């Protein structure tokens, strides 16, 4: 009953996020998973890394995947590093103090682009949903948000406080104006989506999906549809994959590069005006040797552009950044898909590549794995033995977290650890079994054709004298270690492809996991078929035995750990967990508490006697693959498909009242303004408008009208009965102001009429008892304006009725043939007359 928290991380040199280069080559900032690495290129050592406050594995850690690092961007003048994580959160660190200082979460998806001016202290964020959000660092709030796209944001360029240009996967370019805070122009970039956007002040480069870049002209012209942005050029044939990023550099000649999806990054050069002149005069020679002129205006694209060269990297790429000096050498820092960093250099003399291929140097690959780890072992609580797919076996130590040596063996499937001499024994996907060292020379043996197909598992006794392997040729081969060669004592032939082998710790039982979903259990000294475990509905993938050889754990492809007893073969417990498929279970070396790791990226730590999940662990996000426990102490090691290795260590006014208050406010304001105007006429001080009006941007007469519209029409008569006569007088003054603001009058003519007539019909006695010439003149003006408005609408209606009746009668005159006989005409109209159905009782 202890807790477990993670305390380490390995193997992740660079993951799915951009890389930011810093000069003094300088250093590079790349991304681990919920972590950011920074290192020199000269030596490649972790000079710093940024964690968070609480470690994952604590009870206060939320039981979900912590989001990855998805984008990061630094301002060196302000020494700040903003970072966007995939659940939409923006953090900012320093590099000196390297601590979080403020936090943003406006978006609800992954975060794709971060463009920020520490000069302007403005951070503009484009996420994986369709909104772009402009934050202010010194304001620490969400300043505003431009949301008009419909898929995502992947191209992005801001200029001053004026313009913002973004390209989104609903494959279009939108030009936003920031002053009016809205999108002015739109152009469809490509047929499908479009990703890359590079902006020099004249030309603009937009890639598509089909090896097609488009060259655009940009202005500040006053036209509505064109003028701002035009479509001068189309250029073809970069590479058949998609173009992902366009980055643009200067010194004067200038360059840029298109980062594709495949192994290639293509660098292009844009030339100068004298080469423009030479090209146009040579094409003029081609002209003399108008339709040909516009053909030249079509070839304008290749006339401007110039393919400098390509960089054919290794297997795949992720991102890149420019590093150029002297206009004679240009360099690219590149992060690949697998965990490698490469520094590529090119010498040139402003015309020519001066090389058949770019030179590849300053490559960082050591502390990573370069592919995914399939198997994991531990060595006497001192070392770790990882192995992966590209032949890379690797030996790590827990103290200084680095490697020791590296081998090549092919597609590796299982590594085990002979403690005698600390040797490593690996079985591959080719049917072979190799054996390497750590202190002496690298390789000892490659037993070739140990089996005819892929062996699947391997183990060995606590004595270290006999090995057992299980292979998909229906074969279980028992080997002995002779003095340092290996012979095969015995070969057992079975019926199905064996998927796992496990020898009991106390040299008692041999468990075999067969693809026909069963577990055989043999006696180790006799091979006499002591037991069979049955009923997993899917092939069992992992078997382990307790320290006293009494409880078997078996785990299969249908998400349920089954605990069986070794005294009779009775299943003690079924236990459903791990929503995809459990790949490994491992006991503690002391008692019945085990760990389970699966294809849904959760490491669950169970008590066996209670059959309970003591702990859930949420280190990483992709599929877990391997797990191993310490022989004596009790640290845990889990390695996963994101090339990640984790090491775990233990520790309300009614209507009526609202109308009265709004009428109070409005008539107060109107009387104040009119008294000021009378004082202005006396002159021939402006009173300040009230807080609510200055806060909602409404004239007071529209404020009163709005509260009349908020009053629901079931309680309006009760409201106008509730208010007293002083507020009746204020109401009449308000309607006078409406009649002076005639357009409100015609837009809300019914409601104003109904309320006025009802108030006067209620209060007729006291209102006619009052003697007031201002009342007389107000009611005169209200009467005249009301008759004017209502007679206007009435004249419109009467004219329309007479006109439409004339039109319909004239068409009936032209196209309705009258039968002369009266009964026939009656029956004609009674047949062609419109009908309607209704449900009556008899």
């Amino acid at each position: 009953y202890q807790r477990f928290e993670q305390a380490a991380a390995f193997g992740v040199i660079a993951s799915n996020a951009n890389c930011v280069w810093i000069p003094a080559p300088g250093q590079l900032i790349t991304s681990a998973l919920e972590d950011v690495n920074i290192w020199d290129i000269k030596t490649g050592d972790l000079v710093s890394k940024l964690s968070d406050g609480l470690p994952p594995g604590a009870s206060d850690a939320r039981g979900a995947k912590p989001a990855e690092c998805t984008y990061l961007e630094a301002h060196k003048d302000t020494d700040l590093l903003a970072v966007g994580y995939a659940d939409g959160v923006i953090k900012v660190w320093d590099l000196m103090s390297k601590t979080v200082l403020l936090n943003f979460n406006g978006h609800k998806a992954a975060i794709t682009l971060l463009q920020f001016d520490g000069t302007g202290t403005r951070l503009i964020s484009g996420s994986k949903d369709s909104n772009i959000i402009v934050w202010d660092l010194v304001g620490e709030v969400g300043l505003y948000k431009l949301r008009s796209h419909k898929d995502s944001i992947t191209g992005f360029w801001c200029q001053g406080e004026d313009w913002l240009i973004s390209t989104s996967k609903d494959g279009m370019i939108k030009l936003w104006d920031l002053k009016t805070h809205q999108c002015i122009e739109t152009h469809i970039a490509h047929t499908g989506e479009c990703w890359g956007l590079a902006v020099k002040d004249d030309l603009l480069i937009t890639t598509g999906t089909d090896s097609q870049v488009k060259i655009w002209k940009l202005d500040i012209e006053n036209d509505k549809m064109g003028g701002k942005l035009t479509e001068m050029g189309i250029f073809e044939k970069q590479s058949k994959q998609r173009g992902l990023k366009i980055e643009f550099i200067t010194n004067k000649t200038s360059f840029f590069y298109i980062q594709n999806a495949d192994k290639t990054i293509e660098t292009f050069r844009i030339r100068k005006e004298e080469e423009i002149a030479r090209g146009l005069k040579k094409r003029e020679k081609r002209l003399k040797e108008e339709e040909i002129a516009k053909s030249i205006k079509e070839s304008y694209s290749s006339f401007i552009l110039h393919p400098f060269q390509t960089i054919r990297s290794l297997y795949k790429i992720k991102s890149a950044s420019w590093t150029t000096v002297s206009s004679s050498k240009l360099e690219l820092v590149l992060t690949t898909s697998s965990n490698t960093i490469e520094y590529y250099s090119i010498p040139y003399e402003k015309r020519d590549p001066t090389s058949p291929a770019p030179l590849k140097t300053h490559t960082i690959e050591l502390q990573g794995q370069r592919t995914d780890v399939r198997s994991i072992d531990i060595s006497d609580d001192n070392k770790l033995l990882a192995t992966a797919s590209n032949g890379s076996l690797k030996i790590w130590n827990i103290k200084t977290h680095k490697c020791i040596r590296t081998f090549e063996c092919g597609y590796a499937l299982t590594c085990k650890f002979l403690p005698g001499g600390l040797l490593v024994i690996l079985g591959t996907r080719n049917g072979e079994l190799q054996l390497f060292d750590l202190a002496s020379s690298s390789l000892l043996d490659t037993i070739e054709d140990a089996h005819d197909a892929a062996i699947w598992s391997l183990d060995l006794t606590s004595d270290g004298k006999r090995l057992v392997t299980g292979s998909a040729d229906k074969t279980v081969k028992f080997w002995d270690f002779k003095v340092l060669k290996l012979h095969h004592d015995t070969t057992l032939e079975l019926t199905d492809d064996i998927l796992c082998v496990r020898v009991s710790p106390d040299d008692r039982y041999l468990a075999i996991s067969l693809l026909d979903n069963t577990v055989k259990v043999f006696f180790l000294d006799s091979m006499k078929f002591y037991l069979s475990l049955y009923g997993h509905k899917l092939p069992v993938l992992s078997i382990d035995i307790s320290f006293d050889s009494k409880m078997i754990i078996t785990s299969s492809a249908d998400k349920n750990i089954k605990i069986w007893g070794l005294d009779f073969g009775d299943c003690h417990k079924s236990l459903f967990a791990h929503q995809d498929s459990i790949m490994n279970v491992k006991f503690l070396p002391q008692s019945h508490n085990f760990f389970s790791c699966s294809k849904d990226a959760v490491v669950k730590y169970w008590d066996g006697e209670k059959f309970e999940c003591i702990q859930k662990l949420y280190a990483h996000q992709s599929e877990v693959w391997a797990l191993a426990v310490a022989t004596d102490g009790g640290f845990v090691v889990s390695s996963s498909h994101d090339h990640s290795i984790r090491i775990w260590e233990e520790t309300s006014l009614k209507a009526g009242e609202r109308l009265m208050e709004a009428l109070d406010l409005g008539i107060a304001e109107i009387e104040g303004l009119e008294a000021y105007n009378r004082d202005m006429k006396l002159w021939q001080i402006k009173p300040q408008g009230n807080a609510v009006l200055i806060a909602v941007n409404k004239t007071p007469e529209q404020y009163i009208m709005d509260t009349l519209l908020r009053i629901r029409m079931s309680q309006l008569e009760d409201a106008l009965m509730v208010m007293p006569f002083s507020y009746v007088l204020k109401f009449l003054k308000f309607i006078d102001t409406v009649m002076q603001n005639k357009t409100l009058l015609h837009s809300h003519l019914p409601l104003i009429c109904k309320n006025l007539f009802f108030i006067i019909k209620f209060n007729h006695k006291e209102l006619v008892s009052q003697k007031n010439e201002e009342l007389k003149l107000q009611i005169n003006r209200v009467k005249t304006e009301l008759r004017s408005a209502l007679k206007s609408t009435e004249d419109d209606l009467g004219f329309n009725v007479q006109g439409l009746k004339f039109v319909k009668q004239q068409w009936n005159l032209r196209h309705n043939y009258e039968f002369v006989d009266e009964y026939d005409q009656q029956e004609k109209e009674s047949n062609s007359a419109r009908k309607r159905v209704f449900g009556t009782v008899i």
Partner: protein, 431 residues
């Protein structure tokens, strides 16, 4: 030109776009099967007469040489085949197959089946040879020898056509019943079953895009589907009684279908231009929609109205008309430029505008805007033109009674405001 083996003892050449006919004679009995090389100038004719003859073609002086003659056997030659050509212009051989149970492979003779055979297809690599019959099977053998490589076994009640998907290298067979079967050369097992057809297929072929199979049909129809899942993409019904023949130009995807009757049609691929015109309409639409929004926000009620009437966006149209009325509250009824635009409106736009105006005339809050636009239509259009527009009388019959109801309501409202007048009367009497 198109080569036709009809039910007449004369090969017929017709130009494809179509009236001129070239009739060439080589034998007394009617033609039965026809084949052509991939490059034009070589054709092979099998007739009901035992003679099978190969014609050289000559697009100089128009020659149709009958130069290769084959007497063969004492039955009817029912199918012919020649896959390829050597560079010098002598296609290597001709493999024909007969009314009786034999075939022959003659330079420029083995048992085949039980019943009559149906059709002969060739391999692109010029090595293997397919031949079916009415006995529910197909057979594939060598070209250098008559050794049977394999045999596709069985069906319900027969086979009608066989063909080779050249790119994917598949064996298609138009069945005797209402289906198509697709097999592969690896195991010769059932790769794809194509169903959904009505009576009988009688012809099956690949497409030039190497992904779509075409099946004709004796119920007078044609189906074109994707072979990846076997689901229909298009179905063409230009025919009336049957299907008998289907051929294809590869480079420009130009298929031609002919039946037992005289109707005779050519289809051409145009999906590229369809998608092109669609994307052009989309580009024009997004451009004028953005222009609509900018005009709407910046003012310009006339131009915003024009774009709203051309785009049919009734909510923005209603807001344009409401804002224009709110502006010209200060015999024009709107902005004068807007009035001129309405006077230069057109027919379908008049039907559209009066339809939407009837809709807004329904409720009592928007009846004012509806009355203004009706009055503008009346004050600036011709009444005879309005009466002669189709459907305008239906719309006017829908419009009138709501205007009568609104007239009575506003009349009653004025009748009510005379209480204001009465209050003035009594107040002035008191004072």
């Amino acid at each position: 030109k198109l080569a036709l083996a009809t039910n007449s003892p004369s090969l017929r050449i017709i130009p494809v776009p179509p009236l001129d006919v070239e009739i060439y004679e080589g034998h007394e009995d009617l033609l039965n099967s026809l084949d052509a090389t991939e490059d034009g100038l070589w054709i092979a004719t099998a007739s009901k007469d035992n003679t099978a003859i190969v014609w050289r073609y000559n697009e100089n002086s128009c020659k149709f040489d009958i130069y290769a003659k084959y007497i063969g056997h004492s039955a009817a030659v029912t199918a012919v085949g020649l896959p390829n050509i050597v560079s010098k212009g002598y296609p290597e051989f001709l493999l024909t197959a007969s009314n009786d149970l034999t075939i022959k492979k003659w330079i420029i003779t083995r048992h085949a089946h039980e019943k009559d055979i149906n059709a002969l297809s060739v391999s692109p690599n010029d090595s293997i040879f397919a031949t079916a019959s009415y006995d529910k099977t197909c057979k594939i053998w060598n070209l250098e020898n008559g050794e049977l490589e394999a045999t596709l076994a069985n069906h319900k009640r027969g086979l009608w056509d066989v063909s080779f998907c050249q790119y994917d290298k598949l064996l298609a067979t138009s069945s005797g019943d209402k289906t198509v079967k697709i097999w592969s050369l690896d195991t010769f097992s059932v790769m794809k079953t194509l169903e959904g057809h009505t009576n009988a297929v009688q012809r099956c072929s690949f497409i030039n895009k190497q992904k779509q199979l075409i099946s004709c049909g004796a119920d007078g129809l044609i189906k074109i589907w994707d072979c990846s899942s076997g689901e229909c993409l298009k179905t063409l019904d230009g025919h009336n009684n049957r299907l008998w023949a289907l051929s294809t130009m590869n480079d420009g995807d130009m298929i031609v279908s002919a039946d037992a009757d005289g109707v005779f049609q050519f289809w051409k691929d145009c999906t590229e231009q369809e998608i092109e015109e669609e994307q052009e309409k989309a580009k024009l639409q997004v451009e004028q929609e953005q222009s609509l929004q900018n005009y709407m926000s910046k003012g310009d009620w006339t131009n915003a109205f024009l774009l709203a009437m051309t785009l049919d966006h009734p909510m923005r149209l209603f807001n344009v008309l409401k804002r224009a009325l709110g502006e010209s509250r200060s015999e024009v009824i709107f902005n004068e430029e807007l009035d001129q635009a309405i006077s230069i409106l057109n027919d379908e736009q008049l039907i559209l505008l009066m339809k939407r105006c009837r809709d807004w005339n329904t409720n009592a809050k928007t009846h004012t805007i509806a009355q203004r636009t009706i009055r503008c239509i009346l004050m600036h259009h011709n009444i005879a033109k309005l009466s002669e527009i189709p459907g305008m009388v239906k719309i006017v019959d829908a419009i009138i009674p709501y205007t009568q109801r609104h007239f009575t309501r506003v009349d009653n409202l004025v009748e009510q405001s005379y209480i204001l007048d009465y209050a003035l009367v009594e107040m002035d009497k008191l004072f």
